[PDB]
């Protein structure tokens, strides 16, 4: 009778506030769920602060990272000095008496999730830094964010990668041609083009900002023929060594989403600009989308080839024990790791200059040499321009 | 400086009374003990039990057993389960010094009773047990015996060992209530004979080894002291007659009996055993082996295989270990720590309960390691960084064949019986 | 005065005509002959050839009859004279002074019109009754005939280049070309005049070739509005069959003349004093599979320097003077034309088929891309795809086309616009055009593109460009990528990837040893070199510099085992000369 991981609590606190007696409720800036009594909130914040101050007697205070009780595990994270995020989890149970199996949880995945939460909040609203009363009401953005699965997490969600879109040269040159908008219209500072879910042509932007833009677009615009209007939306992205606000304009062709970054130190754009952009851009974008769709219509061991410099993976994705091993052995010179599990699964890993390769095999009648040969066959079949210098 | 150490061991009471600390004075650290007790009680108020804390390079492990609080902190590469095993060893040491019934009754008595009174004069055993690791200054294989929880057997030809065992079991046959007779020499078991219906468990044997190694007053007298074996009987005592063999053969013999009055009989039996050993020239073989620095046969075997730095082979039926001598480039301390970390990591990954493995092959920058867990043995080899794979497999197979050939010389299959 | 037709700044000068002397012009060799007193006192010669005007003064008596033409041989050895319709004499010239004793007299009944040279030693005669062809012999002093034809002729026309004589029948409603050469004369398919009833006159028919293809020109007036026009037929059909291909819209009235200057059909109007250019290759309107054309510039006069009704216009660009005694050659001033025409695409099309349209075309592109730049995009999107087609047609056929622009021509143009915000778009547009026309990018363009992409912080485009192999895969390009290595690390990743693509292992080994990765470099070397060629000295020194005491031991042990495998010993051969490292190892690791 498996119970698997659930979510028990999530809160943000700042110990600086409420140093005077009787203001113990000023610590909490957010608590989830909101149905809990105030005393329990204060007790949980007190426990977290006690653990942090106990750790802070051997090393630096900003080193605390986790707690493992018998049935709940907590994760700490400090994005800015003073502010802490905590993610209480629930240990899976096994019934045969209760058999807690809190040894099947990898802290890296959920700590990465904690990182992504703050990254998205920063993208939309900015940094965390009375103003605390404004902040506490602006933090009820993290109410729909945790309303829109904890058990289903893997290495891809740990590394924040997006799949790769292969295109022929002519279509790519045609698509990249949409860079004359910054010249015909001097106001536009940046443009990014997406296919349905893969990034088609996004340039002059760091991978983190591109991931944030892609995640926001997929979450809002795609899930729930021209300029999509929401019921002047500002974003905070870093360009030229500084994070600055920018207006975001989203234009939707058939399957193509084109995000335009207008300058945000002037007044909001008027209707004439929208009309000009529409009448200047609609037909070419429609034709390009139709051509790409037609071309894409014209066009056992697993694998997963991850790139660490652009966060674009390429896979064809395995029991839970196998999935747990991939997230364990992951990240410096090259290396080569081969592992066989009890249930007869062979796992091979390579690490070239900046990449990671994985191959999973299911063969119980193989030796070390046979497995190496099979992995080499797969690597040669699914890749060109041999990178390992196998010769 | 105090907080920069590589290992800390704190022992508390359920009320928060300091008892033992590996570093520093137990009375200078009252506030830390109070903080720990408050934290544990605070967590327990929610019908829950705290186990560990991971904080960016430092790990803490907690244990609450029989109204005691055991806390261990370590900056090494050890995981939390291995620290829990270490804490269990410390608790077993405490349980051996004070039998379980005595401590449970005294705790059922006044709740604020200081246990340092009853644990006075036995700090040497704790310090030896916690210094048995290579963290501070030690360059030996006791860390390798601790990691895999097994002992090492003295390498002698089968004839000498059979003669010694036959002599002991023939001389000590008529005595009533003799449970175990153990003969060890230089931190290495030589022979062991036990009663038919009662066996021994590796934890108790390692405890006996620690008691013999730490104490030094066993050489100048025929000491008669009691010992408690938690696995044998956790509420009853055993009385041990401990004495060395002679002034030229430094092998120590222990006779364990349940009767507190039978001591002269044990002395007479020991005298007869030593006489019958000296008659048949076994002491000469023991002394000759004690002078060899590195067991030249295994040295020749290892040097016969280049691109091999270290290994440790352990069978599955019994808890015994075989490993060669430390050689270059691992003769320093930093490289020794690195090698210890490598074995810790491999051992933790192989024996993980949630996701166990069967074979690990790695080709890191400065080494080529290999682990293996067959149904009848368990190997952990380390090769040179620029070796191919077929050569590694050939060397491993040849080494395993040689080890299987010379089995009775290095391992004991079945123990003797009275 | 801003005009497009001018004259020669250094005109040729000759003796003016008088009441007695006559002037005779040869179109075939561009020579004007001025006879004096029937040639007895000396005839002057003016024309092309040597920088000094070649003049041959000769004596010849007065035999009666006005001369219509005297013409040397194509090798200038024999001349000819004609006096009367029935007595035509063939005179022989020897050396540089007339041997008058060798003159030959010939008699023919046919109605004589004219004579032509079809070869260096062959004279062909045109007569009304019907053509023929003769061949002279000075030895026996008679002239032989080979073939003939037979067609009444009112007037004729001759071409020196293609040797195609256009003849008008005495019936007055038929024109037939004849191709005349050595021993072979044959009729051509009769020209489809369209209107077999129109009257033909001398000033209504001109013959001349444009772009190297012979064409016939006929003047006409509009059948609907009465406006004058020019009817053009090109002799480009299979078998040199005449075929109408173009019609010019003049939209004026009066007298007109046509020359052919720089492959342009120039039309002159004496009444209005204006000239009109017509470029045949320019895109014009087509009606009933016949293309109609209009002047490319507003009507303007010849540049005023030095439209009198006294000139005689000779093809292709010859204008002579009767009472003035001079002769010019027409020319074009392309600098004013580059400003008069405003449409950049039209100007590029006009300049891509000229004789000097390279120095002006490159200047136009440079002005359009550097000085007068605007948000132009669709103009230089078309100029490229206009000349890159010519460049591709040159390659796929391997006479080179007139005006040809390669990559090295316009790489120099893009140099002056480097380090500007808008350079990336221009470079990418050029690369897109090249890729569309399937032309590889050479080293310099690839280097420029890499530099611009790196400077503008665009790495996804760089990765995609390298992925498709759109940049030259050279070791110099690899060095160029690797020399930056500090703006970011993705540049280093791309450089190493494309170094490994071309299998340049020594550079990879040197780079890896530069960072301080001795074991990986040694692993690569023992697979590339082969374990019998690895340098022990270099690797031992590199491992000794790191000061790690583990890499040193591993390298030393690897070389010890190499010595064991090769020489069945664990010692270092004296050839290596590395006893210092042996001493260092022995002291470092005690035995």
UniProtKB/Swiss-Prot annotation, chain A:
It comes from the Eukaryota. Keywords: Cytoplasm, Guanine-nucleotide releasing factor, Transport. The keyword Cytoplasm applies. One of its GO terms (biological process) is endosome to lysosome transport via multivesicular body sorting pathway. Disruption phenotype: Accumulation of autophagosomes and reduced number of autolysosomes in fat cells caused by disruption of Rab7 recruitment to autophagosomes leading to a defect in autophagosome-autolysosome fusion. Impaired lysosomal degradation of endocytosed Notch and Boss receptors in the developing eye leading to their accumulation in the brain. GO terms for molecular function: guanyl-nucleotide exchange factor activity. GO terms for cellular component: cytosol; intracellular membrane-bounded organelle; Mon1-Ccz1 complex. It is found in: Cytoplasm, Cytosol. The Rab7 guanyl-nucleotide exchange factor (GEF) activity of the Mon1-Ccz1 complex is autoinhibited by the N-terminal disordered region of Mon1. GEF activity is stimulated by Rab5-mediated recruitment to membranes. Signal peptide: none annotated. Pfam families: Intu_longin_1, Intu_longin_2, Intu_longin_3. InterPro entries: Ccz1, CCZ1/INTU/HSP4_longin_1, CCZ1/INTU/HSP4_longin_3, CCZ1/INTU_longin_2. Belongs to the CCZ1 family. Part of the Mon1-Ccz1 guanyl-nucleotide exchange factor complex specific for Rab7 that promotes the exchange of GDP to GTP, converting Rab7 from an inactive GDP-bound form into an active GTP-bound form. Required for recruitment of Rab7 to endosomal and autophagosomal membranes to mediate endolysosomal and autolysosomal vesicle maturation. Required for fusion of multivesicular bodies and lysosomes but not their formation or trafficking. Involved in the replacement of Rab5 (and possibly Rab4) with Rab7, also known as Rab conversion or the Rab cascade, during endosomal maturation. PANTHER family: VACUOLAR FUSION PROTEIN CCZ1 HOMOLOG-RELATED (PTHR13056:SF0). This is Vacuolar fusion protein CCZ1 homolog. It comes from Drosophila melanogaster.
Swiss-Prot record, chain B:
The keyword Cytoplasm applies. Disruption phenotype: Accumulation of autophagosomes and reduced number of autolysosomes in fat cells caused by disruption of Rab7 recruitment to autophagosomes leading to a defect in autophagosome-autolysosome fusion. Impaired lysosomal degradation of endocytosed Notch and Boss receptors in the developing eye. One of its GO terms (molecular function) is lipid binding. Keywords: Cytoplasm, Guanine-nucleotide releasing factor, Lipid-binding, Transport. Component of the Mon1-Ccz1 guanyl-nucleotide exchange factor complex made up of Mon1, Ccz1 and Bulli; the interaction of Bulli with the Mon1-Ccz1 heterodimer is mediated via the C-terminal Mic1 domain of Bulli. Mon1 and Ccz1 form a stable complex which displays Rab7 GEF activity with or without Bulli; GEF activity is enhanced by Bulli possibly by improving membrane association of the complex. Interacts with Rab5 and Rab7; preferentially binds GTP-bound Rab5 and GDP-bound Rab7. GO terms for biological process: endosome to lysosome transport via multivesicular body sorting pathway; neuromuscular junction development; protein targeting to vacuole. The chain holds residues 111 to 528 of 528 of the full protein. It comes from Drosophila melanogaster. It comes from the Eukaryota. Belongs to the MON1/SAND family. The keyword Cytoplasm applies. The disordered N-terminal is involved in autoinhibition of the Mon1-Ccz1 complex guanyl-nucleotide exchange factor activity. Its main location: cytoplasm. The Rab7 guanyl-nucleotide exchange factor (GEF) activity of the Mon1-Ccz1 complex is autoinhibited by the N-terminal disordered region of Mon1. GEF activity is stimulated by Rab5-mediated recruitment to membranes. This is Vacuolar fusion protein MON1 homolog. GO terms for cellular component: cytosol; Mon1-Ccz1 complex; synaptic cleft. Changing residue 224 to A: Reduced Rab5-dependent Mon1-Ccz1 complex GEF activity towards Rab7 on membranes but not in solution, possibly due to disruption of interaction with Rab5. The gene is Mon1.
Curated annotation (Swiss-Prot), chain C:
Keywords: Endosome, Transport. The keyword Electron transport does not apply. Changing residue 493 to A: Reduced interaction with Ccz1. Changing residue 497 to R: Disruption of interaction with Ccz1. Disruption phenotype: Viable and fertile but with reduced lifespan, possibly due to impaired nephrocyte scavenger function. Severely impaired nephrocyte function under physiological stress conditions such as aging. Accumulation in nephrocytes of third instar larvae of enlarged alpha-vesicles (late endosomes) due to defects in endolysosomal maturation and lysosome acidification. GO terms for molecular function: guanyl-nucleotide exchange factor adaptor activity. InterPro entries: RMC1 (IPR040371), RMC1_C (IPR009755), RMC1_N (IPR049040). Coiled coil: none annotated. It comes from the Eukaryota. Residues 420-574 form the Mic1 domain. GO terms for cellular component: late endosome membrane; Mon1-Ccz1 complex. The keyword Chloroplast does not apply. One of its GO terms (biological process) is regulation of autophagy. It is found in: Late endosome. The C-terminal Mic1 domain consists of an alpha-solenoid structure that acts as a protein interaction scaffold for the CCZ1-MON1 complex. Component of the Mon1-Ccz1 guanyl-nucleotide exchange factor complex made up of Mon1, Ccz1 and Bulli; the interaction of Bulli with the Mon1-Ccz1 heterodimer is mediated via the C-terminal Mic1 domain of Bulli. Mon1 and Ccz1 form a stable complex which displays Rab7 GEF activity with or without Bulli; GEF activity is enhanced by Bulli possibly by improving membrane association of the complex. Belongs to the RMC1 family. 'Bulli' is the nickname of a classical German bus from the 1970s (the Volkswagen Type 2 van), which facilitated cargo trafficking. Positive regulator of the Rab7 guanyl-nucleotide exchange activity of the Mon1-Ccz1 complex, possibly by enhancing its endosomal membrane association. As part of the Mon1-Ccz1 complex involved in endolysosomal biogenesis possibly by mediating Rab conversion, the replacement of Rab5 with Rab7 during late endosome maturation.
């Amino acid at each position: 009778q498996r119970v698997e991981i659930t979510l028990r609590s999530f809160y943000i606190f700042n110990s600086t506030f409420g140093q005077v007696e009787g203001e113990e409720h000023k610590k909490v800036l957010f608590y989830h769920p909101n149905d809990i009594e105030l005393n329990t909130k204060i007790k949980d914040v007190g426990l977290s602060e006690a653990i942090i101050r106990f750790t802070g007697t051997f090393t630096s205070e900003d080193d605390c990272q986790a707690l493992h009780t018998q049935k709940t595990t907590q994760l700490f994270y400090q994005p800015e000095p003073g502010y802490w995020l905590v993610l209480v989890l629930n240990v899976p149970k096994e019934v045969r008496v209760a058999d807690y199996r809190g040894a099947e949880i990898s802290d890296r995945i959920y700590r990465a999730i904690l990182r992504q939460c703050y990254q998205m909040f920063r993208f939309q609203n900015g940094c965390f830094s009375n103003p605390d009363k404004r902040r506490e009401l602006l933090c009820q953005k993290l109410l729909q964010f945790y309303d829109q699965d904890p058990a289903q997490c893997d290495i891809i969600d740990m590394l924040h990668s997006i799949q790769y879109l292969p295109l022929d040269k002519t279509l790519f040159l045609r698509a990249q041609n949409f860079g004359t908008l910054c010249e015909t219209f001097p106001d536009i500072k940046e443009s990014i083009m997406l296919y349905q879910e893969q990034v088609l042509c996004g340039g002059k932007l760091s991978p983190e900002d591109l991931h944030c833009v892609h995640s926001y677009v997929v979450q809002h615009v795609l899930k729930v023929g021209g300029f999509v209007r929401s019921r002047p939306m500002k974003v905070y992205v870093t360009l030229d060594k500084e994070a600055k606000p920018y207006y975001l304009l989203i234009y939707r062709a058939l399957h193509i989403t084109l995000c335009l970054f207008l300058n945000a130190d002037q007044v909001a754009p008027k209707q004439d600009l929208y009309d000009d952009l529409h009448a200047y851009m609609a037909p070419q974008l429609t034709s390009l989308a139709r051509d790409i769709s037609s071309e894409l219509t014209k066009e056992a061991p697993k694998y997963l080839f991850i790139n660490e410099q652009s966060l674009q993976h390429h896979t064809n994705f395995n029991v839970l024990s196998i999935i747990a091993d991939l997230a364990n052995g992951s990240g410096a010179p090259a290396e080569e790791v081969q592992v066989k599990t009890t249930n007869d699964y062979w796992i091979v890993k390579r690490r070239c200059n900046y990449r990671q390769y994985y191959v999973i095999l299911c063969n119980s009648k193989a030796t070390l040499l046979d497995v190496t040969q099979e992995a080499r066959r797969i690597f040669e079949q699914e890749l060109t321009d041999d990178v390992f210098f196998d010769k | 400086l105090w907080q920069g150490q590589k290992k800390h061991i704190f022992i508390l009471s359920e009320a928060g009374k300091p008892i033992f600390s590996l570093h520093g004075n137990e009375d200078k650290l009252a506030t830390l003990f109070g903080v720990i007790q408050a934290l544990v009680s605070f967590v327990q108020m929610g019908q829950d039990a705290i186990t560990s804390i991971h904080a960016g390079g430092i790990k803490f492990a907690f244990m609450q057993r029989s109204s005691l609080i055991l806390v261990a902190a370590s900056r090494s590469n050890m995981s939390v389960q291995q620290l829990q095993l270490q804490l269990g060893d410390v608790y077993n040491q405490i349980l051996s010094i004070l039998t379980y019934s005595h401590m449970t009754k005294i705790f059922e008595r006044r709740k604020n009773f200081d246990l340092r009174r009853l644990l006075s004069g036995s700090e040497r055993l704790f310090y030896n047990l916690l210094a048995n690791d290579s963290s501070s200054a030690k360059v030996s294989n006791n860390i390798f015996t601790f990691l895999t929880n097994s002992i090492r057997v003295f390498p002698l030809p089968t004839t000498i060992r059979s003669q010694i065992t036959s002599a002991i079991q023939s001389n000590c046959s008529k005595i009533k209530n003799l449970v175990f007779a153990v003969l060890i020499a230089n931190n290495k078991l030589i022979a062991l004979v036990r009663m038919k219906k009662y066996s021994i468990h590796p934890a108790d044997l390692r405890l006996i080894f620690n008691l013999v190694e730490c104490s030094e007053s066993f050489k100048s007298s025929e000491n008669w002291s009691p010992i408690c074996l938690p696995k044998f009987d956790m509420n009853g005592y055993l009385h041990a007659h401990v004495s060395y063999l002679a002034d030229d053969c430094q092998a120590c013999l222990l006779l364990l009996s349940v009767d507190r009055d039978a001591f002269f009989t044990l002395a007479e039996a020991k005298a007869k055993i030593t006489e019958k050993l000296r008659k048949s020239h076994c002491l000469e073989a023991i002394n000759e082996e004690l002078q060899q620095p590195f067991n030249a046969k295994l040295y020749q075997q290892v040097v016969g295989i280049p691109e091999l730095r270290h290994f440790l082979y352990k069978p599955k039926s019994t808890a015994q270990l075989l490993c060669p001598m430390l050689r270059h480039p691992y003769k320093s301390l930093t490289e020794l720590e690195r090698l210890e970390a490598i074995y810790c990591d491999l051992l933790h990954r192989i024996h993980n309960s949630s996701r166990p493995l069967k074979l690990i092959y790695e080709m890191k920058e400065r080494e080529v390691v290999l682990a293996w867990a067959t149904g009848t043995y368990e190997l952990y080899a380390i090769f040179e960084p620029v070796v191919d794979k077929a050569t590694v497999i050939k060397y491993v197979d040849k080494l395993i064949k040689w080890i299987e050939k010379e089995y009775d010389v290095y391992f004991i299959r079945n123990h003797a019986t009275f | 005065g801003i005009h497009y037709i001018e004259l020669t700044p250094n005109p040729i000068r000759f003796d003016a005509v008088s009441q007695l002397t006559n002037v005779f012009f040869d179109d075939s060799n561009k020579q004007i002959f001025a006879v004096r007193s029937g040639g007895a006192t000396g005839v002057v010669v003016k024309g092309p050839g040597s920088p000094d005007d070649v003049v041959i003064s000769f004596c010849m008596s007065d035999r009666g009859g006005a001369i219509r033409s005297i013409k040397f041989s194509p090798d200038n050895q024999i001349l000819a004279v004609q006096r009367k319709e029935n007595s035509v004499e063939f005179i022989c010239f020897q050396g540089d002074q007339p041997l008058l004793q060798d003159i030959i007299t010939h008699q023919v009944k046919t109605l004589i019109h004219g004579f032509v040279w079809v070869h260096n030693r062959e004279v062909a005669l045109i007569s009304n009754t019907g053509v023929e062809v003769y061949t002279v012999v000075p030895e026996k002093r008679q002239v032989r005939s080979v073939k003939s034809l037979s067609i009444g002729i009112k007037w004729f026309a001759w071409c020196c280049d293609a040797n195609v004589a256009l003849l008008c029948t005495s019936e007055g409603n038929s024109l037939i070309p004849v191709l005349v050469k050595q021993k072979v004369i044959t009729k051509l398919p009769k020209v489809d005049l369209g209107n077999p009833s129109r009257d033909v006159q001398e000033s209504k028919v001109t013959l001349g070739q444009v772009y190297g293809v012979l064409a016939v020109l006929i003047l006409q007036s509009n059948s609907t509005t009465g406006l004058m026009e020019v009817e053009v037929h090109l002799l480009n059909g299979p078998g040199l069959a005449p075929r109408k291909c173009h019609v010019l819209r003049l939209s004026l009235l009066g007298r007109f003349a046509i020359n052919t200057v720089d492959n342009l059909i120039v039309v002159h109007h004496q009444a209005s004093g204006t000239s009109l250019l017509f470029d045949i290759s320019l895109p014009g309107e087509v009606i009933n599979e016949i293309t109609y054309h209009t002047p490319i510039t507003p009507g303007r006069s010849i540049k005023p320097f030095g439209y009198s009704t006294h000139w005689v216009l000779f093809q292709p660009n010859i204008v002579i003077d009767a009472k003035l005694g001079c002769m010019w050659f027409l020319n074009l001033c392309i600098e004013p034309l580059c400003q008069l025409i405003s449409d950049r695409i039209r100007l590029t099309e006009f300049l891509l088929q000229r004789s000097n349209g390279k120095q002006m075309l490159l200047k136009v592109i440079g002005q359009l891309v550097d000085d007068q730049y605007k948000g132009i995009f669709s103009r230089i999107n078309k100029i490229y795809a206009s000349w890159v087609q010519l460049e591709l047609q040159n390659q796929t056929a391997q006479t080179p086309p007139i005006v040809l622009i390669e990559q090295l021509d316009m790489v120099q143009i893009f140099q002056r616009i480097a380090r500007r915000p808008y350079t990336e778009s221009i470079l990418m547009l050029y690369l897109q055009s090249l890729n569309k026309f399937n032309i590889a990018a050479q080293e310099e363009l690839s280097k420029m593109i890499i530099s611009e992409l790196i400077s503008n912080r665009s790495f996804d485009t760089l990765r995609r460009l390298v992925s498709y192999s759109m940049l030259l895969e050279s070791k110099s390009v690899a060095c160029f990528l690797l020399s930056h290595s500090n703006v970011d690390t993705a540049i280093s990743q791309v450089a190493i990837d494309m170094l490994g693509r071309i299998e340049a292992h020594e550079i990879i080994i040197e780079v890896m040893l530069g960072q301080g990765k001795v074991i990986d470099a040694l692993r690569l070397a023992k697979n590339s070199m082969g374990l019998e060629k690895v340098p022990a000295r270099k690797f031992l020194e590199a491992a000794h510099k790191t000061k790690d005491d583990l890499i040193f031991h591993s390298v030393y042990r690897f070389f010890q085992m190499r010595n064991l495998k090769l020489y069945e010993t664990l010692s270092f051969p004296k050839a290596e000369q590395c006893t210092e490292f042996i001493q260092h190892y022995n002291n470092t690791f005690p035995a």
